Design a protein around this ligand. Structure first.
Ligand code: HEC
Length: 116
């Protein structure tokens, strides 16, 4: 590969899980279980292990609103650089809620609080 390997079809596959209690609460658990070590708690790359990798962990806060549910989901599923694909360990519910958590927090930090 030479970057992001994700099929456009699955990019438009919006995770069939309503962003709410289960997505955000449970998603936070799966997030703090795995993602925080590189993407951090504030989705800004606050991860301690994010300093011993090669590719940029990216500012999910800004990245997530610009990306689609399926796109982000597939990357957690199959992997994205130094992060292994969790699609074999985690189920759809785990990853789908992860994306909802990511999307919600990112958009919340992008929109709410910003007057410009
Ligand atoms: C360090 C080993 C990581 C852990 C742990 C997790 N992620 Fe990650 N992620 C990492 C990198 C270096 C990158 C970018 C590499 C690239 O090819 O661009 C990413 C990217 C993502 C993305 C896509 C964001 C974007 O490219 O705009 C998503 C959606 C993502 N990561 C999700 C994610 C989740 C849910 C994790 C916990 C289960 C997680 N990552 C852990 C590095 C690392």
């Amino acid at each position: 590969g030479s970057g992001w390997e994700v099929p456009e079809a699955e990019i438009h596959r919006e995770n069939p899980i309503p962003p709410d209690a289960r997505s955000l609460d449970q998603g936070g658990v799966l997030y703090a279980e795995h993602c925080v070590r590189c993407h951090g708690e504030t989705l800004r790359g606050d991860g301690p292990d994010a300093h011993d990798l090669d590719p940029p962990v990216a500012d999910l806060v800004e990245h997530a609103p610009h990306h689609s549910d399926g796109d982000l989901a597939y990357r957690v599923r199959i992997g994205r650089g130094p992060m292994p694909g969790f699609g074999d360990a985690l189920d759809e519910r785990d990853i789908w809620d992860l994306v909802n958590f990511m999307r919600d927090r990112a958009q919340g930090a992008a929109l709410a609080g910003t007057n410009g």
